[PDB]
Structures are given as structure tokens and as C-alpha cells.
Amino acid sequence: WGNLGHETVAYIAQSFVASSTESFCQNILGDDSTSYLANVATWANTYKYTDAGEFSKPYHFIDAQDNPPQSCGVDYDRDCGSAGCSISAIQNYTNILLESPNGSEALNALKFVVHIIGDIHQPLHDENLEAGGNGIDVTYDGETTNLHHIWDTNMPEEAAGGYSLSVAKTYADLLTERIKTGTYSSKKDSWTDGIDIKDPVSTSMIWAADANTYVCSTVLDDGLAYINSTDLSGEYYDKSQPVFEELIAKAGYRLAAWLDLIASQPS
Ligand SMILES: Nc1ccn([C@H]2C[C@H](O)[C@@H](CO)O2)c(=O)n1
Ligand SMILES: Nc1ccn([C@H]2C[C@H](O)[C@@H](CO)O2)c(=O)n1
Ligand SMILES: *[C@@H]1O[C@H](CO)[C@@H](O)[C@H](O)[C@H]1NC(C)=O
Ligand SMILES: *[C@@H]1O[C@H](CO)[C@@H](O)[C@H](O)[C@H]1NC(C)=O
Ligand SMILES: [Zn+2]
Ligand SMILES: [Zn+2]
Ligand SMILES: [Zn+2]
């Protein structure tokens, strides 16, 4: 996701974590504002463009070698690669937070988890084709961009009605209400099925597989000729919106569940 998506995911998580989980995170982050998760939700992106953080670029995605839009699937051994991926990074950073929650590595590990649980839920972060759709040129409301970018940024910003942190907070609260009492309330019990703090690979693979199904159903089902030749702010947007909204909601809810687990380990 772009900044709006990541900040939305983070504000949703802040709405669902336990009070002790909140304190646990605020201490690690050295940020006790009411935007504590949202303030750091883009850090991993910032960091990957620095000298020290270049190595972490591959941690934002898993390049699933599947066959969309006819068939989708993610396979950890097949797809992660020797440079690491979203799934191997969730393992590494979760385990840092379990083994050394007070240590010097906990700050970055937490910021990585917050960002990467978000990124896993963006379907094109679970797809090899043309570098997660970066290589696919599109027109969006008259602007030339690419397919990955519209999923990350153009479409969520359009749906949220902006890009600022305060817009993110309002979008988060909309989606949060959908979870508590609205259209997602009968789905959310299934959203933490299979979650296991002792098996970050399996757990994050559930989420990656889930987002990946949308590559076939939604992202690419019109086919590449349609996508090359049509302005995607029309019908493509209209059918994309409910999918990215639900996936952002899931990302937030799952991030909160995972943070609760990490924060509750005895010591
Ligand atoms: N194989 C790839 C390559 C890049 N990206 C993401 C991370 C990059 O910062 C962004 C570029 O728009 O897309 C992706 O998800 N999959
Ligand atoms: N994430 C972003 C960043 C910028 N802009 C647009 C609106 C801003 O006014 C302009 C900045 O030059 O670009 C946008 O819509 N989304
Ligand atoms: C785990 O995280 C640390 C700190 O960013 C990094 O040095 C290391 O290479 C990572 N290990 C794996 C296996 O991803
Ligand atoms: C997109 O259009 C360009 C130029 O019209 C052409 O080179 C290319 O083959 C097209 N790609 C697809 C998948 O239609
Ligand atoms: Zn992102
Ligand atoms: Zn992206
Ligand atoms: Zn990222």
C-alpha cells in the first residue's frame, strides 16, 4: 500500500488491540500519541531506500509464481527466494519481538510487522507477474501510472477521499465500524482462523494466500488487453473498492490480533 493504506491499517489495529498491547507498543516505539502505530506504518518503506536498509526491499512482498488470472496460489518454498520475502520477514521480526522485546532490535521489528502485515494484504504484493504489476502500464483518471500503483495508492485515496493522516483516521473508523456492527461483523470471526504465534510462517501464509486469490478474481480477471486499453477509474475501480476495503479491514484486525499475541508472552 501507499501511505494512506498503511496508516488506515494501523489505525484499525489501534482500535482493536488490548490496553496492555497499546502500552507494550508505545514503549517499544517511544511514541505515546494517539497515532502511535499510524505514525510508524510507512517506516519500512522509508528504510528500504537508505543505505542500511537496502537489504530489506524484498521483505515487502512474496512473488507468487502462479498462473493468474486462471489460477492463483502461493507456495512459501517456491516463492520466497533466497533474499527473503514478506513471510520470512514476519517470521524473523515476530521472533525478535518474542525473544527480545526489550532489546535494541525491537523498535525496527515492530515497525516492520506493522508495515508488512499491511503489505501482505495488498493482492499484488503476493504475485510475481511483472514485478507485482509494477511493469503493467495503465491509465487512471487520465494519468499514466501502473497497475501496482493504482492498487497501492490511486484507488484507496479515491475511496478515502484524500491521503493525509486525518483522512486515514476517518477511513479507519469507517472500516472499524463495518467490523464491529456493519457489513463485516458476520465475517470477522473467520478472520483469525488458524492464527498461531508459534508458527509465523503458517500464519502469514494464510493471509498472503487470501489476498492472492483476489489477483485472479479481481485484479487481473478482465485480462491484460482490457487493462492496457481502458481507463481504470471507471468500472475497474467500482469492482476493486469493496475488495481493497475488506482487505484493509482484515489487515488491521489481524495486525491487532498478532500484536496482542506478541505483547502477551510471559517473562
Ligand atoms: N515484485 C515486486 C516488486 C515491487 N513490489 C512493491 C514494493 C515496491 O516499493 C513497490 C513499487 O511500486 O511495489 C511488489 O510488491 N512486488
Ligand atoms: N499520496 C499523494 C501525494 C500527492 N497527491 C497529489 C495531491 C497533491 O496536492 C499533489 C502534490 O504535488 O499530488 C496525491 O493525491 N496523493
Ligand atoms: C532478521 O532481521 C535482522 C535485522 O533487520 C537482519 O539483520 C537479518 O538479516 C534478518 N534475518 C532474516 C533471516 O531475515
Ligand atoms: C498495449 O498497447 C501497446 C501500444 O498500443 C502495445 O505495444 C502492447 O502490445 C499492448 N499490450 C497488451 C497486453 O495489449
Ligand atoms: Zn505498502
Ligand atoms: Zn506496493
Ligand atoms: Zn512496503
Residue numbers in the entry: 21 to 287
Please share text taken word for word from the publication where this structure appeared.
S1 nuclease from Aspergillus oryzae (EC 3.1.30.1; NCBI sequence ID: XP_001818636; S1–P1 nuclease family in Pfam, PF02265) is an extracellular, single–strand–specific, sugar non–specific, Zn2+–dependent, fungal nuclease with 3'–mononucleotidase activity with a pH optimum in range 4.0–4.3. S1 nuclease has the phospholipase C/P1 nuclease–like fold stabilized by two disulfide bridges. The active site is located in a surface cleft and composed of the obligatory catalytic trinuclear zinc cluster supplemented by Lys68 and the nucleoside binding site 1 (NBS1; also called Phe site in the previous studies). A cluster of three zinc ions coordinates the substrate/product scissile phosphate and the reaction mechanism utilizes water activated by Zn2+ ions as a nucleophile.
The mutant D65N has the same tertiary structure as the wild type. The active site organization is also unchanged, with the only difference being the change of Asp65 to Asn. Products of 3’monunucleotidase activity are bound in the active site: phosphate with 2’–deoxycytidine or 2'–deoxyguanosine. A phosphate ion is bound inside the zinc cluster in the first binding mode in protein chain A. The second molecule of dCyt binds in the secondary binding site composed of Tyr183 providing a stacking interaction for the nucleobase and Glu177 providing hydrogen bonding. We refer to this site as “Half–Tyr site” with respect to the P1 nuclease Tyr site which is composed of two tyrosine residues. Chain B also contains a phosphate ion in the first binding mode. Simultaneously, one molecule of 2'–deoxyguanosine (dGua) is bound in the active site, interacting with NBS1 and the zinc cluster. In this binding mode deoxyribose is oriented out of the active site without any direct interaction with the protein.
